[PDB]
Amino acid sequence: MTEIALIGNPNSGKTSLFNLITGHNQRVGNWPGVTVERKSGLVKKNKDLEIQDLPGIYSMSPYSPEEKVARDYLLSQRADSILNVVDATNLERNLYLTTQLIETGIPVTIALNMIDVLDGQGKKINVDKLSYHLGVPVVATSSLKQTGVDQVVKKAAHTTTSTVGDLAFPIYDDRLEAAISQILEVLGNSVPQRSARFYAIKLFEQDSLVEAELDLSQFQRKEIEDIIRITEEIFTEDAESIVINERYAFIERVCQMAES
Ligand SMILES: Nc1nc2c(ncn2[C@@H]2O[C@H](COP(=O)(O)OP(=O)(O)O)[C@@H](O)[C@H]2O)c(=O)[nH]1
Structure with a gap:
């Protein structure tokens, strides 16, 4: 009954996180007339939530089927929420897609992923500050350590087009x-x-x-x-x-x- 679009850059840990959330409830086909794989699945801990996995992209340009698919899905308003998987170790590059995702009008919740890897590099990201400035909720996640995954899915499920009244776009x-x-x-x-x-x-x-x-x-x-x-x-x-x-x-x- 609630639909959540999972999307991010390639090698941000989208599949790992998807497989942890959905488990043995996945359906795998493809998008119409094109070789782009289409994965969908229900949340193990709440079957009323459906995760729509979208292809990994670096931006929403019109010059590839992967991006054209992601764009067409998000503009159609089939998703109630965007769960944006962001690789924390490569934050600046990752947020380029995020700015475009926020502009779609579907509410974005960020899975600041691979946070355990950031701990091994000596860098630190202030999550509240990040959340205040992007204007979106942010939860730290690790697919390896299995931390913050139920938290970020829950936040995505409650941060929807129905619940968010006043969206704040990047100025x-x-x-x-x-x-x-x-x-x-x-x-x-x-x-x-x-x-x-x-x-x-x-x-x-x-x-x-x-x-x-x-x-x-x-x-x-x-x-x-x-x-x-x-x-x-x-x-x-x-x-x-x-x-x-x-x-x-x-x-x-x-x-x-x-x-x-
Ligand atoms: N340390 C760490 N590595 C991860 C995590 N999630 C994924 N990886 C690794 O990052 C790579 C990308 O994972 P994948 O889920 O295929 O990313 P995708 O390309 O976004 O689907 C793989 O080699 C994983 O072993 C994580 O939470 N922590």
Whole structure:
């Protein structure tokens, strides 16, 4: 009755964590007409929770079936919650996907995974600080030591589209935030309220799939074009690089607050 999308970078420990949560309740097939494996399963300790395992990705670009699948699932609102598996030892790179996942509008809970490995390296991540700055709940997890796994699944199960009333998105440079606002005003009700920021940001980036699979009017197209052009002049960069740099700056800022 509650659906949780499990997703993260490759080699973040998604499968290990998935197998510990779901155990001998797994169903393994594939996505329609494509060789990407599709795993699903019910939570051992609560059969009313279903985990939808998604493919491991580094971002939500449109140039591969793995990412196109992850994107299409999250935008459809089939999941009530995102359980984002983050490799704690490679935190800065991992959070690039997280910023995009938070923007989908489905609530994110973070499984800060492989925490035992971080203990063996001498680094320390302040979990409360990390949680306050990303604006999402965070639980430390180890698939090896089997710690914090029931805690993070429980938190995911109670942090859903039904329970979270007011979502806090990552704030970027105010000049980029103006553009996103202007893109939202023009889009109107052409996009769902929940995932609106995702679409606005992706149209700014000039993403092929969103542009090519959205029935906008011609005036809406021309308005967004000017928002993009004008913004590029303010920054003296192309639209794609503006967003990339602003994500990495926000991530850099966050890690410096939480890292040792
Ligand atoms: N030390 C430690 N290693 C882990 C943990 N979880 C996974 N691994 C290791 O990390 C690698 C990736 O695991 P896997 O679940 O396949 O990651 P995925 O690519 O995200 O599915 C494997 O070689 C595991 O042995 C953990 O909690 N602690």
